[PDB]
Amino acid sequence: HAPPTLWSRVTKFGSGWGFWVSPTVFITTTHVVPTGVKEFFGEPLSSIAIHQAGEFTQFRFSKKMRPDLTGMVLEEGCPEGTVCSVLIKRDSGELLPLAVRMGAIASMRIQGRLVHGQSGMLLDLGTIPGDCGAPYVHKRGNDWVVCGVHAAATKSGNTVVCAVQA
């Protein structure tokens, strides 16, 4: 079960969400990033290192934005066959951890976007268009790990796709 501090890392951002990996590192899905702004979280862009590839966006800030947090491991994709939790927040405030059995990493073209992503089967509650950037996480021993951010789902909703770090 995900504890409150972990949920407190899931953050409304743009047209979806993003996730504080550490006091200084925030990840989200590229296409939810708001366009035509000069600052994220009150910091100007000249102050932020931004790595974007394949619908995976990473901000590294120059100050501690969330000093209440410890740093967590960010993996380059989820281990195939691991059951992750998708830490979905809804605009209502409802928390919706969705269990997903992760599959293979793959390049994909989704409505024209190059997605470096990982498919998963949802294990009735699905994702919605407002959920992108929600983190995919799992517990390894005693610690939670993050491995992707929500990016797409199929028409039925039974299969989801998170973007993963190169």
UniProtKB/Swiss-Prot annotation:
Inhibited by the chemical compound K36/GC376, which covalently binds to the nucleophilic cysteine residue. Inhibited by various macrocyclic inhibitors. Changing residue 55 to A: Complete loss of 3CLpro activity. Residues 2-166 form the Peptidase C37 domain. The active site is at residues 31, 55, 132. It catalyses: Endopeptidase with a preference for cleavage when the P1 position is occupied by Glu-|-Xaa and the P1' position is occupied by Gly-|-Yaa. Processes the polyprotein. 3CLpro-RdRp is first released by autocleavage, then all other proteins are cleaved. May cleave host polyadenylate-binding protein thereby inhibiting cellular translation. Homodimer. Monomer; in solution. This is 3C-like protease. The chain holds residues 1101 to 1273 of 1789 of the full protein.
